């Protein structure tokens, strides 16, 4: 569970460039032989994506921020990639979304999973039938409070090692929209030596996950290898095959989706990438003719918000009222009308010079930003036991017989020793 790998070594987060990856269908709506403009979380073209690989002395399983969404791309031969772990803390403290392909079917579960140092899945002791069927479940130790579960169709996953170039390409898109998770999938063969192929691809929805949880980080699972001949310490002596996976970031950009006759996307344009792409977006066409065109309007954003209000001097003597030499009796409470001046409540409410303070209907902070019509101050002295009677809808010797506050009283009560 928590046993760290012997040969694992940390590496700096190297970056690599993508050609046109990050294009997917925003929804299930079908369109063909048209150029549609839409804005949604997209991976900008020619952007930088993390460069990670898995080998026998560098094993990559870092924790990456999820933000609003991320993009996945990896080149595989034996399909080393196993799955992913999604969640805020990736621990039982909250719910975490997980996707695992354990050689039988894609399993999606949302529960409170126990965090592990290096979660993953693997197989052992194949001998004379490759199998490669899930043997150990290190993804999490225990689960509870399961609010969602899904199962896909059964299939056999081929984890057997192969030589030559990378014959497989898998690219997934992960995003969150008001708690609604959308997963897109694409699978095409390739012949690649390193990095990523130069081309275009379109990703399609895989599953619908209306879960509704906050996810800020995620992990990438990898599949290791084991054998009767070269085992290791449990479980630090296990090794994995050669594979490379890349992780991107999605941003709210607008793309021009060019739809063919069959509806498949054959080209895409990123407005924020190239001013030529900006011209294409403005013209809503994938071809730009020679000439000069107006695309948008530049503007200089303000550096900061500057507020210069007039002097708040000529304040009415609230301090004198609170510290006056004498106060009127509770039955003879004086009704003081205050107007034609400014009120500075910062020195009153925030000075912590009074034992107790409370407001009815409006919080003290909001009152500082509000302009009133009429303000009245009622000053009186009562015993300690009678202080609790000063409130809307109260009764007693003071509330009923001396001074009564209406149930709709929107003022505040101030008292001190």
């Amino acid at each position, epitope marked *: *569970q928590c*046993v760290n790998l012997t040969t694992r070594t940390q590496l700096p987060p190297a970056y690599t460039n993508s050609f046109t990856r990050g294009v997917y269908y925003p929804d299930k709506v079908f369109r063909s032989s048209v150029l549609h403009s839409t804005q949604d979380l997209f991976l900008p073209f020619f952007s930088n994506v993390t460069w990670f690989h898995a080998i026998h002395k560098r094993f990559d399983n870092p924790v990456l921020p999820f933000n609003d969404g991320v993009y996945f791309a990896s080149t595989e031969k034996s399909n080393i990639i196993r799955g992913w772990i999604f969640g805020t803390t990736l621990d039982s403290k909250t719910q975490s979304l997980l996707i695992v392909n354990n050689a039988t079917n894609v399993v999606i579960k949302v529960c409170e999973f126990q965090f592990c140092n290096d979660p993953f899945l693997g197989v*052992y*002791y*194949h*001998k*004379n039938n490759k199998s490669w069927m899930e*043997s*150990e*479940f*290190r993804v999490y130790s225990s689960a509870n409070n399961c609010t969602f579960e899904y199962v896909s169709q059964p299939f056999l996953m081929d984890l057997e090692g192969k030589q030559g170039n990378f014959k497989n390409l898998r690219e997934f898109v992960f995003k969150n929209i008001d708690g609604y998770f959308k997963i897109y999938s694409k699978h095409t063969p390739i012949n690649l030596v390193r990095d990523l192929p130069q081309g275009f691809s379109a990703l399609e929805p895989l599953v619908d996950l209306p879960i509704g949880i906050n996810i800020t980080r995620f992990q990438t699972l990898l599949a290791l290898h*084991r*054998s*009767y*001949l070269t*085992p*290791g*310490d*449990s*479980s630090s*002596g*296990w090794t994995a095959g050669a594979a490379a996976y890349y992780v991107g970031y999605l941003q709210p950009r607008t793309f021009l989706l060019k739809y063919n006759e069959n509806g498949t996307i054959t080209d895409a344009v990123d407005c924020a990438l190239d001013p030529l792409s900006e011209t294409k977006c403005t013209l809503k066409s994938f071809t730009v003719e020679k000439g000069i065109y107006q695309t948008s309007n530049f503007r200089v954003q303000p550096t900061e918000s500057i507020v210069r209000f007039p002097n708040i001097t000529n304040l009415c003597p609230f301090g004198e009222v609170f510290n006056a030499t004498r106060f009127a009796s509770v039955y003879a409470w004086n009704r003081k009308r205050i107007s034609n001046c400014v009120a500075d409540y910062s020195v009153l409410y925030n000075s912590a010079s009074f034992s107790t303070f409370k407001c009815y209907g409006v919080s003290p902070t909001k009152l500082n930003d509000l302009c009133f019509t009429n303000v009245y101050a009622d000053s009186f002295v009562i015993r300690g036991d009678e202080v609790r009677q000063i409130a809307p809808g109260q009764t007693g010797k003071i509330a009923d017989y001396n001074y009564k506050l209406p149930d709709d009283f929107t003022g505040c009560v101030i008292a001190w020793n």
Partner: antibody
Amino acid sequence: EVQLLQSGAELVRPGALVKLSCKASGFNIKDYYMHWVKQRPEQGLEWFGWIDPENGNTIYDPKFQGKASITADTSSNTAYLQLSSLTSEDTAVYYCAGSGNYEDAMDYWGQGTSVTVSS
Amino acid sequence: DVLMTQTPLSLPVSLGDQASISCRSSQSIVHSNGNTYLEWYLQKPGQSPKLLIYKVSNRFSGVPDRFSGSGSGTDFTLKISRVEAEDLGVYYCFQGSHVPRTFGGGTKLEIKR
């Protein structure tokens, strides 16, 4: 020196259950597999199943599939075995093994436990 | 499920003689890498079985050097250089790896007289 300790013997009536413990000493229970075996005077040895304390997955002999469950205690460094719906045919001597380190090159056995199922 | 058979049931050997115990399996246990998957267990009187050889070609640590195995395919043989008085017991064959493990019929050894 690695040693596996088990109860000397157990006696239970038909239809009851017997719980056996295999203590781990001198080795890490988490990182090493555990095994169980059934021995009879006429049939010699009969394999029962294996368990990984770190993982917990268990496989049972088709003869005894659905007849028993295997559990382990990490904190106590002891492997537990449970048999249910016992009958006369279950009379045998049970053994436990482990300390494999994911490798067949190292394994050990305890003195075993004699379990008799009769009224 | 794999069926394992052993022969002979028992064999005598005087002190210093060579003892041969053979095991048969219903399925091939050798794989692409070329190694063999099998273990030999010996249960002395009043004692539980103890490992003797692993992989048929490598001796277990602490075992006397006289114990060694050889063979190929599904037919193997256990060879003891010089049998001593402490070798009394029953020899067993074991199938490992990831599969319902199989046991042998057993082979008893005795000293000639």
